[PDB]
Amino acid sequence: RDWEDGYRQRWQHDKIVRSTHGVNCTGSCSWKIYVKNGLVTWETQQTDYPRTRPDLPNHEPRGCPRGASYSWYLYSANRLKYPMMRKRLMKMWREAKALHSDPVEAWASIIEDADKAKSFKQARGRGGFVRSSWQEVNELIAASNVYTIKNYGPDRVAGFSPIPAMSMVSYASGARYLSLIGGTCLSFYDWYCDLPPASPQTWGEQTDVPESADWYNSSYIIAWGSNVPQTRTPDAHFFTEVRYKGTKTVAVTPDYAEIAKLCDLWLAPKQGTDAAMALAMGHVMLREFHLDNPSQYFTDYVRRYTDMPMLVMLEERDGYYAAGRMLRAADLVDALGQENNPEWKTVAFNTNGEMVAPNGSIGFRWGEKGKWNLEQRDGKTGEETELQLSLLGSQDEIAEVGFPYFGGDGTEHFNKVELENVLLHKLPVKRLQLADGSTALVTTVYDLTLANYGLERGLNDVNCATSYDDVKAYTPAWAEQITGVSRSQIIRIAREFADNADKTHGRSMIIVGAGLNHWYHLDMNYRGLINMLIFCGCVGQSGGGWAHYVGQEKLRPQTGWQPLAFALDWQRPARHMNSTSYFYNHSSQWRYETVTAEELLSPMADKSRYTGHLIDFNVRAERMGWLPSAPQLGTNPLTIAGEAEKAGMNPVDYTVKSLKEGSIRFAAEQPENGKNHPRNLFIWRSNLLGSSGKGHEFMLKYLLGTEHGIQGKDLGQQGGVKPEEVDWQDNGLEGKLDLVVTLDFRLSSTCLYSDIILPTATWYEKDDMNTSDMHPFIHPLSAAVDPAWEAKSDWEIYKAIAKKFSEVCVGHLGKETDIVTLPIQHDSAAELAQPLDVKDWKKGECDLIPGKTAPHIMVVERDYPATYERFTSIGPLMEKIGNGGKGIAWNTQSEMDLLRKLNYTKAEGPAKGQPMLNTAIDAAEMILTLAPETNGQVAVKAWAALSEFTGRDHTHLALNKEDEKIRFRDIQAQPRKIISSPTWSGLEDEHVSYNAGYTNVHELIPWRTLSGRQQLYQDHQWMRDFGESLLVYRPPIDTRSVKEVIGQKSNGNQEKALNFLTPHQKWGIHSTYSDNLLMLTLGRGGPVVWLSEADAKDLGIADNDWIEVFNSNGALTARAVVSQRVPAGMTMMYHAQERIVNLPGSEITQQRGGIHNSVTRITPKPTHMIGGYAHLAYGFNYYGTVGSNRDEFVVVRKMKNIDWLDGEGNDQVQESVK
Amino acid sequence: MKIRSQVGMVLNLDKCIGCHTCSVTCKNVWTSREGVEYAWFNNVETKPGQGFPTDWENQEKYKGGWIRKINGKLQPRMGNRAMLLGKIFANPHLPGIDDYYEPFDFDYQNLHTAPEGSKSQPIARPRSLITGERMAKIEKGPNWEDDLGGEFDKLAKDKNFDNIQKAMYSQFENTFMMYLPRLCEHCLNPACVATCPSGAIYKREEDGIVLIDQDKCRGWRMCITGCPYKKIYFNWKSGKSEKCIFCYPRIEAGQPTVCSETCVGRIRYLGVLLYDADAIERAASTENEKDLYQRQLDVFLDPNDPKVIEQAIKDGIPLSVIEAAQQSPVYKMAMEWKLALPLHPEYRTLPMVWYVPPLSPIQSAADAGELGSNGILPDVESLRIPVQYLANLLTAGDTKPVLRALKRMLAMRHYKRAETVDGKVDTRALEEVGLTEAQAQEMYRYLAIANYEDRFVVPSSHREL
């Protein structure tokens, strides 16, 4: 009847607009945004993606429950509508302004007054926000920036924003402003611990993985520490559907996770011990498919694509030998006929016993052309050769080599197997007379590997296995004791996996994630899985390989976006910084370090050469140009040029001289001296101070200068030993940040602790672009409605700040000269820095040579009053120098000519005649036109540049797509697939899906490693001395965070120490959506923690009881979720719950309960600090220390008093435990 | 004899990942209103569990569905006509708010307006959407048991664990969990229609969609008790009841329901089914509970039979609807391959939203075992999910139809692996389950590739008439 028209009317709408989500999920899903009466009402997925091959499932509809709830945010009660400022700060700002008409002077009068400063800094996170205006906040922000740059330096200003792929222009907005003024741009991939150091170590690549549709081409898949249905939702169907094609799937998780539901088998190893299982599996694979019944496919594969045939020099020790660095052409007489970089070319024996320097080692990459390829050819004669794998059978003798074993150094919480700290093995060796006349013994990476796995080969090695049941280093029986997983399961799966790979030539795949990558020894977890895939020739074959998925790390049109984001079109270089080191330093988490480098060393290392605090290793790496610094120098870099002049020297020589004598020092040596810490911080597209940042309480104490919940004592208080490179103070400097500016659309935890909050446009109110690792489409974010209330897009917000800055700086900053340090970069000729060992110029072991034994020292001219005009225009450097990345470069004049027609040009001023960058769409068109993956004309030029290096034609990969040009307005009509480009190793082809390593294997392009092949052996001095030259099991570390505080503040209830894991949640993407009512209603209405039934019973905890979790780092409050699916001994607080909703007071700190990162703290690893060594050289987000976190242990107990600390008389009391 | 058409729906639970996207999109479009904020027309429950409202499958408790009188005739379990009208005044079985959950919100504004000099960090506390008062603690939600959240012995009170020796499943190594997304079944013998004396509830003749006339509803609520799936919710603000409307505004235009098109897992299929409306009473009245499944299959007509077509046209079914029925993916799954099964057929409503049971990891053992009938792939007997459990859920306790569905999907996998990995034709598994290569290939086409045009085959309703 007529009443039916009611529901019909509800569905009717005014229009649908296409947009996506700028959140770090990797989803990259296109949606239909419905508008009714000028308001967004709901969204449903777009289904018009270009379809995949008929034999593969299509992508539609993608989507997930979080994204489906985004519309809730637009007019919600938590929406940020106007610029906000802390009341106390606004009061002082206005009083000061009445005294000083110049805002810079105004700011000065405030921040130079200890009492005034302390006044608003202590108000952080304590209410009092007041509505301001754009004009007011823009002037204050600009004045602060000018004051900081002028009195301390450009690099005392910084910005944090991650994952540019989820919203490219939005990321670029702030990064471009900062890069122009010289501020610091902080990294995120390493900081978040999504970067797997094992990737750069093995392939010389940040991360390149198969697309999800490629899982469908696989016939055997293991989901290892990856909760696919929950953390890869829009792609999960490829996994569920491929099972119908006959593909067997295996889930490896300690708990019964959602992924288990989808597999044919569930294996539950003890969390953190996965490397042990991987080792035993590789052991079985080597025994049966390489040794006992040699696989034709596997053998040929490892011979041509790995460093297994490469020779390693043995170091003579007391009674035995230690594996040293890899033999180089320069070690032999006449350097094997290599005049160019002979010290960077590895060596192997051909199948005729002759030595040869094979094509492809990193030495052939620079200084010459045409031999940097994986053709099996003699690098001297050019003739084809066949490399020899094993020396067994042609050895001159047998040596006993020592291998480090840590499988017995576990903590009391994990099972261990005692053997010997050093295991001696029988190795076939050859005697060589080096160029200096001396003799050396060598062996291949191949037998060192077989030895390390404990495989008996006909010698009488007592440390090798006589059976899989023999408890020896890395046998199933050994792994069974360490992991708890049945030895027969380990054996059966290793066989099926390898057998499947042999029958299909590599179509076996391992999907892995943060479950394994967030452990301190993520390096070993990954190298374990990687070795299995390599032994089976899976890497580089469609349907096979290393499928690492974490955040939305892959911004496909990389070289088009880089120049925009870091203003490389106007000035080079910018100031990049690796965040883990940055925060370990400035939030002073190093002052509480409990882990020593000494306990990480290989038993065969010279302890005396590795003394000092972990932070000393970082400072040393920085001075050697291995890692970046921020702030860089202990003096304002804008004042160095004027002194070099007074001293009749050029800026660079003056700086090098000063560093040598000590008149100028690296700021990292004296971090608390009052001039070497960041003072201004911009935060956007991030909830750092409230969820991302590990060591939450330390950040509150040292960065913000506010109340905190740290429970333990620092270094001085425990009589511990201090740093040898950094000064020490019993009372660390607190409240370092003078101003914290956060841009968001919802009032997050970070916002709650900022000084100024800027309202930004939601994803449905602005234009931008988005790409992902999961699929090959680039699509847009669009404005279905104009920004609500007083919100503005990130691009417009930073543009306005830039415009105001250009005005406020006049008279304070003009055309300045800046001295910028730049670490030795991977993918640059300088990557061939220190070939044979490590020398520290500061220790007088070599001279300070910029770009080789020290960072590069660069001169950058900055026209401060022209900041806005440069921001809003594409610079002349693209036409003068060119564009490029990943080691190649090309001319891009044709793209600039086109951009002048699409964006129009400046009619006057400093950038007269340059293409304009007024709108977000102008910036998007710049990215699309410049990138090889979106402009076929550039793709061909890029492939041609690479062809010069390899000597092989690669242009055929993009020639058939030359002429294709992706335009912003076209992707609004339909998402488009990108173009095959040299920036990536997978292909965009009609017949084969995108599979990483495909071009290396099929086009014979070398991996960017020392040997040019997949690097199984790491020969850098530090890798060797820290025991990681080869894969070895390393148990979870002891953070020593419980012992000192357990039982110290009893509340009467039973306490217990448990392993604190933080896998990503089902009701949000990180903290985004965490405050969204739809997600809160489908979850449990706020912060909760999962506990096994056993542990819960022991603690007298019932489902949903209020509990407290803490350790020396801090404390958090939450409700419990008691479940059978959680194994005893571990607790899970799904990552992303924040500090703004449903949290009562803490009984441990008497403050608002903390977050999951209140109980964690940064602890770096020296091997992640290595630089100046081919594949181990710096790159923004490419290498650097990571924010590992799964090793953490905490104290858990039922809460007693539930106080909300809010003033109402609504507090509760939970009945005792008894 | 009266031929009717209805768009049936099949959810492949083997592919469900329990994401709840389906629940969010339905909520956004149809129930984001005061009065039904607590109602989820489409909701997903993790099993083992008691669900939403709590223990809804317990008819002895809620009195839903039909019962068969000793005289062979059907009567609502909640009473005859007389008793029903009496329950307009007193109905002691209605689901209480605690059986669902007290809907809540949070004081987000406190984060914005917290005054200067606050003694602690401002926080957003919960507040009831019903009373508007502060809530000291959230104790319930519509999805509280998600992913086995709660002590097992409490979750195990699941009605489907009836007649099953539970003990062993209360052990870590034997853990199992599945997801049950569900909406209104738009039944052929709706108990809701029979429990509302005024006739405010009706099943549309053109498409079988069951709706509650908002003008006619008086809030008597016997229908809430009557529906054994508890899919009718009281709108406390309007004083009327509401339920899933099968997105008729979209179905009438030849589009999928919102929850089907937005299903991230691509597990939902929509297709036309023709049936003899005059054969429903007899089928729902069959004596043995375990015959209800087959009796319902018997009312579905063959859209390709010339007489059926002829009769359909005479009864007013547009030719385009009949042609859609001939391409129905739902017919193939329910009638031909026998993969889809009804949800609780014993309630006697002849539900129209069917389910394909899920496969699961093999049972835990430690003894890695050896190859089986299906090689490295599982054999139906080794699946960790107790088949009796799936039987109580989908076939009134009869494991035979469930084992057949599961066994047929496994056979497809075995056949396809031989083809794609060994490059050979092996039909042993197919022969063992009564399927031909042609069938296995079409199953693969619809279940694995699942192109959009194959998942939804919905004809428009010819509104010009």
Ligand SMILES: Nc1nc2c(c(=O)[nH]1)N[C@H]1C(S)=C(S)[C@@H](COP(=O)(O)OP(=O)(O)OC[C@H]3O[C@@H](n4cnc5c(=O)[nH]c(N)nc54)[C@H](O)[C@@H]3O)O[C@H]1N2
């Ligand atoms: N819904 C949703 N999806 C997300 C995100 C989100 O916040 N929400 N985050 C995205 C981002 S940025 C990232 S980096 C990824 C991370 O997501 P994943 O790569 O899935 O990482 P984890 O969540 O740690 O997943 C590890 C899984 O393995 C198990 N596990 C835990 N510890 C171990 C261990 O030591 N060994 C083994 N074998 N298993 C273990 C757990 O059951 C857990 O579910 O998620 C992405 N997807």
Ligand SMILES: Nc1nc2c(c(=O)[nH]1)N[C@H]1C(S)=C(S)[C@@H](COP(=O)(O)OP(=O)(O)OC[C@H]3O[C@@H](n4cnc5c(=O)[nH]c(N)nc54)[C@H](O)[C@@H]3O)O[C@H]1N2
């Ligand atoms: N203990 C522990 N810590 C972890 C992890 C873990 O597993 N364990 N996971 C780590 C990992 S892998 C990651 S990826 C990080 C993620 O950490 P974050 O990057 O902090 O993640 P979100 O919480 O999503 O923060 C994004 C913020 O951006 C805002 N936002 C969204 N879009 C826009 C936009 O267009 N403009 C602006 N101006 N703001 C916007 C949102 O409202 C939100 O508050 O957390 C890391 N920290």
Ligand code: SF4
């Ligand atoms: S949040 Fe990410 S995964 Fe979810 S719908 Fe949005 S883009 Fe897709």
Ligand code: SF4
């Ligand atoms: S959207 Fe689809 S896969 Fe996700 S829970 Fe609902 S029915 Fe299952």
Ligand code: SF4
């Ligand atoms: S499931 Fe729907 S049609 Fe069937 S009885 Fe319940 S409300 Fe009525």
Ligand code: SF4
């Ligand atoms: S068919 Fe429509 S009304 Fe019914 S549950 Fe699905 S989306 Fe909601």
Ligand code: F3S
């Ligand atoms: S019994 Fe009838 S009166 Fe309304 S509440 Fe149910 S449709």
Ligand SMILES: [Mo]
């Ligand atoms: Mo991440």
